[PDB]
Ligand binder design. Structure first.
Ligand SMILES: [Mg+2]
Ligand SMILES: [Mg+2]
Ligand SMILES: [Mg+2]
Ligand SMILES: [Mg+2]
Ligand SMILES: [Mg+2]
Ligand SMILES: [Mg+2]
Ligand SMILES: [Mg+2]
Ligand SMILES: [Mg+2]
Ligand SMILES: [Mg+2]
Ligand SMILES: [Mg+2]
Ligand SMILES: [Mg+2]
Ligand SMILES: [Mg+2]
Ligand SMILES: [Mg+2]
Ligand SMILES: [Mg+2]
Ligand SMILES: [Mg+2]
Ligand SMILES: [Mg+2]
Ligand SMILES: [Mg+2]
Ligand SMILES: [Mg+2]
Lengths: 106, 258, 62, 220, 103, 53
RNA sequence: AUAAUAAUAAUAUGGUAAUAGAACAUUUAAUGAUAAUAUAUAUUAGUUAUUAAUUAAUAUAUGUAUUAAUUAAAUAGAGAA
RNA sequence: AAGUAAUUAAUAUUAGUAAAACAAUAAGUUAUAAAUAAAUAGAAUAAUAUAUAUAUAUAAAAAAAUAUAUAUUU
RNA sequence: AAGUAACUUAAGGAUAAGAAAUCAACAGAGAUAUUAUGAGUAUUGGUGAGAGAAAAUAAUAAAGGUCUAAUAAGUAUUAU
């Protein structure tokens, strides 16, 4: 399993700059073991409960919109995304619901 | 209905040219994973590495003499009562002219800092990625990968200059002249260079000895994130680049799924 | 380095997110008092919030 | 230009420490938070000193004792084993037993194990793995769940050195060229525990010679 | 075959040079002056008639024997029957189980 | 790409080579990046002056 | 669904001990063009809602900033002993 | 001319990884199961506490305290 | 506080320790010295102030075991 494959082994769509990944597209990578990266965190002494999504490559905003379209029970203002690390934060505990949606495709 | 309509697969390769040292003539394309040369610029991780390296590199020789290490006798300079002046003890008190320094540090002061291994590996890749994105990373390979363009006879295939030890000519030798014209042709004379090499290349250090102030040669298992970011033009052997990639690859388990 | 306060360690034990303690007053001179009333003097109680801050300092490794 | 001149820490990962005694308008002026006069102003006093009142670490009676002979055991509920199987992470060849060695290697039990792991039954109702298990002990409900799914369980006795050999035998092979033999129980309470069919002890279920030797001496 | 002279550890080599396995060593305590004197056993001086400590202490005896076992050298080492110490399988099998365990 | 650089006399970053996929893109990139500096030396790029106008 | 700036309505803006947030001056280390038509310091007079930095003039030194800016550290700020 | 340093512990923010984390040579640490002074005890036999685990008690329950479960283990 | 400060005495480039009348537990390791986990752990205290190991696993380490005794008695042990 070489880290540098042969020049012939690679094909066009595996080269950065093709297949317009960075536009209107998002990919979420599973953890080392193979579980979805959705975790719950208790903050400020356990009083505040949040849900986080990590390992997001692409456009976080549209992934946020797509999830919002699938879980309309979570209010509009509960979602918040940090741009420094590309993490989507939900003001409640919705690890179960988000995992159900995410696994549908990823 | 489509659950996640805007979801797709990411690319997993970027193209890096392979050339010869004296003249940066391309020889072949060697695909390289996106994690090691094309990664998003996250300055925070670089900031963690740069300060971490900066802390571990300190000497900490500060050593002011405290009131205990200051050489004065422990005798009351003046009687407590009746003298009409302020109360004073021994002549080492910080408030006096010749007294020691309060809260004095003692060498060797400790400034060591520690970082998780995974964070350091990520920072290192982000450094190569920034150099490659800015088109400042040159790879000198061959002799181990398929060649689709013959190597020039005069040029070598590694970061080393031959005939640099036959200095039984004049005050100069061939190695310097080759280096000087290499510097001039590519317009990188006064600019900072970093040469990462597989093994100790005595020829390159000898030729670059005149330019200590701007040219530095480092081995595989010595390069730091500071030196890669500092250098405006990084030259790295393909063998070294592979070694760095393995040493700083995101370990992955089976992760078998349907 | 910081050392656990043994006097506290011998009287307080960690239970969940707080500490557990015995009751004081039922070691001698108990005859003459109703046994049912004295039942409240046997068993364990939980650390009061007033001194919880102290206990963490006394038993840092607990 | 080099990026070294534009690096900046991530927001929220840095504050400014409070300077003391460096200006009135700074907010921490002459007293610098100490207050007005007192022992705490120009001295240090134990944060847990009550002022002479009988302290909270003397009013109450010393309670309990420490069992230096305690044998703490790690925990592994049946829910985890099923979860590993569902996630396709139990690479168990047919006919193989899920002992301590496999649990450590497969990541089922992580971190140091000093004495053993006891199998409990938190997800017994969902457990349908017919593999054969082996651990220091198990709950009665776990035993029922293991056998309900067509499996089996046995309880084995491992000393700290014996357990170490059973966990990474290759270490002993490369060091001494010999895997040390397992140690027979010498405590009454251990012999009694592993001679019970209710606990599925290895002495009773495999009828080791130790019980026979005990029996022959008892009736002699 | 001689080229496995250096393969053996230092202790096993040194023992063989000092006590060649060609000479047969008695299994019982004898006179110190006697050639067939076991270094692992307390021999008795003939003139002073007082027992001598074994030349190889019990740790050194155990070390050399254990190295000998790992490399198949058993009979070449002098006998240790009267050393009141058994190693590995022989100890495990012919073990006098405790009176407390039995009763 | 090697022929384009060898005869043009310039050098293209490896990143652009990976991303650009048609010769039209190569001509558009080279025309919009190297030419403005080549024709007007004052409109050059200085590493010490990245954010320059 | 953001940031900067500007508008309209409303509420608030004394403060010792204390708590919380944000900035400025000096020095050191990493990165870091320019140059006597410049740079540093001092005086005087202006500008910016001003412990600071700037414009001009004057005087002295230097063919010259550890200079702007982002970080990391302080022997980092004195009418109070 | 005056809140400094070393070795530890607990909280808050961010970053990395994540039912695991640090570290890899092993070892160790923490989390993953709550209790009891302690012991060979340890969470839905069929669903939300009316079930279950531990502690007192019992034949077993009730009673008091804490904890556990309603495509995905926190 | 502390077998610390201080005084006195003796020797060498170093000195001290060192090849088990050692640990450990029915399975085993195999001298000494220093550091880390073990461990603030067992243990101990006007059960106050406080004090606090060992086994085992790692790192530096050197060829690291080897006889020089006729195998050791007012010695071990006991009382104090
Ligand atoms: Mg009582
Ligand atoms: Mg009452
Ligand atoms: Mg104030
Ligand atoms: Mg007062
Ligand atoms: Mg005052
Ligand atoms: Mg006060
Ligand atoms: Mg105010
Ligand atoms: Mg720092
Ligand atoms: Mg000062
Ligand atoms: Mg002054
Ligand atoms: Mg003032
Ligand atoms: Mg003492
Ligand atoms: Mg002395
Ligand atoms: Mg000596
Ligand atoms: Mg000696
Ligand atoms: Mg220690
Ligand atoms: Mg003797
Ligand atoms: Mg005595």
């Amino acid at each position: 399993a070489p880290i540098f494959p042969k020049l012939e082994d690679v094909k066009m769509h595996e080269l950065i700059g093709n297949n317009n990944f960075g536009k209107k597209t998002y990919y979420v990578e599973r953890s080392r073991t193979g579980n979805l990266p959705v975790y719950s965190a208790y903050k400020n002494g356990g009083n505040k409960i949040i849900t986080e999504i990590r390992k997001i490559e692409g456009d976080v905003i549209q992934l946020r919109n797509d999830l919002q379209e699938q879980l309309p029970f979570i209010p509009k203002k509960s979602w918040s995304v940090v741009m420094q690390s590309k993490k989507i934060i939900i003001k409640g505990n919705a690890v179960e619901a988000v995992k159900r949606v995410l696994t549908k495709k990823f | 209905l489509n659950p996640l309509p805007n979801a797709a697969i990411p690319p997993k390769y970027a193209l890096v040219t392979v050339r010869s040292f004296p003249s940066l003539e391309p020889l072949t394309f060697v695909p390289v994973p996106t994690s090691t040369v094309a990664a998003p610029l996250r300055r925070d991780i670089l900031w963690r590495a740069v300060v971490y390296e900066n802390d571990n590199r300190r000497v900490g020789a500060s050593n002011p003499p405290g009131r205990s290490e200051n050489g004065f006798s422990r005798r009351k300079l003046m009687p407590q009562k009746g003298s009409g002046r302020a109360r004073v003890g021994d002549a080492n008190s910080p408030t006096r002219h010749n007294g020691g320094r309060a809260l004095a540090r003692t060498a060797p002061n400790d400034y060591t800092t520690e970082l998780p291994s995974k964070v350091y590996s990520m920072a290192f890749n982000n450094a190569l990625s920034h150099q490659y994105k800015s088109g400042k990373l040159f790879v000198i390979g061959g002799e181990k990968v398929d060649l689709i363009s013959p190597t020039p006879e005069l040029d070598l295939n590694r970061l080393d200059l031959v005939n640099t030890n036959t200095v039984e000519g004049k005050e100069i030798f061939e190695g310097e002249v080759i280096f000087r014209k290499f510097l001039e042709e590519f317009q990188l004379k006064g600019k900072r260079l970093l040469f990462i090499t597989d093994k100790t290349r005595e020829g390159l250090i000898k030729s670059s000895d005149p330019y200590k102030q701007k040219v530095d040669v480092i081995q595989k298992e010595l390069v730091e994130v500071n030196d890669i970011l500092r250098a405006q033009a990084v030259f790295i052997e393909l063998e070294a680049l592979e070694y760095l990639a393995m040493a700083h690859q995101k370990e992955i388990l089976h992760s078998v799924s349907n | 380095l910081m050392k656990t306060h043994k006097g506290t360690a011998k009287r307080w034990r960690r239970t969940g997110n707080t500490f557990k303690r015995g009751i004081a007053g039922r070691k001698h001179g108990n005859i003459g008092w109703s046994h049912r009333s004295l039942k409240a003097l046997t068993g364990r109680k939980i650390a009061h919030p007033a001194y919880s801050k102290h206990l963490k300092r006394l038993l840092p490794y607990h | 230009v080099s990026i070294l001149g534009q690096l900046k820490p991530s927001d929220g990962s840095t504050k400014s420490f409070k300077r003391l005694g460096r200006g009135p308008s700074s907010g921490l002026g002459k007293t610098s938070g100490r207050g007005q006069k007192g022992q705490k102003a120009r001295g240090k006093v134990k944060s847990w000193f009550e002022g002479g009142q009988t302290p909270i670490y003397k009013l109450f009676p010393k309670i309990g004792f420490t069992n230096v002979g305690a044998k703490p055991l790690k925990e592994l509920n049946l829910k985890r084993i099923q979860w590993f199987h569902d996630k396709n992470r139990l690479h168990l060849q047919p006919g193989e037993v899920l002992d301590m060695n496999k649990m450590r290697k497969l990541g089922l039990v992580t971190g140091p194990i000093k004495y053993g792991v006891k199998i409990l039954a938190s997800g017994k109702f969902h457990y349908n793995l017919p593999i054969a298990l082996e651990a220091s002990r198990a709950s009665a409900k776990a035993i029922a769940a293991i056998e309900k799914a067509g499996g089996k369980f046995t309880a084995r006795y491992y000393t700290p050195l014996g357990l170490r050999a059973h966990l990474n035998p290759q270490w002993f092979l490369e060091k001494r060229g010999r895997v040390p033999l397992q140690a027979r129980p010498t405590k009454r309470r251990d012999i009694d525990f592993y001679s019970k069919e209710e606990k599925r002890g290895y002495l009773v279920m495999e009828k080791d010679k130790l019980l026979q030797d005990i029996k022959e001496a008892q009736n002699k | 075959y001689k080229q496995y002279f250096d393969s053996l550890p230092l202790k096993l080599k040194s023992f063989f040079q000092r006590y060649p396995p060609s000479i047969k060593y008695s299994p019982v305590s004898t006179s110190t002056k006697a050639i067939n004197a076991n270094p692992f056993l307390p021999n008795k001086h003939p003139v002073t008639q007082r027992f001598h400590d074994p030349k190889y202490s019990l740790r050194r005896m155990s070390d050399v024997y254990k190295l000998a076992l790992r490399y198949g050298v058993e009979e070449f080492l002098p006998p240790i029957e009267n050393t009141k110490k058994l190693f590995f399988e022989e100890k495990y099998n012919k073990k006098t189980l405790m009176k407390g365990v039995l009763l | 790409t090697k022929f384009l650089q060898s005869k043009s006399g310039y050098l293209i970053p490896d990143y652009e080579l990976t991303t650009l996929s048609t010769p039209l893109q190569f001509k558009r990139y080279i025309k919009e990046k190297i030419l403005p500096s080549a024709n007007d030396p004052k409109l050059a790029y200085k590493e010490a002056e990245p954010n320059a106008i």
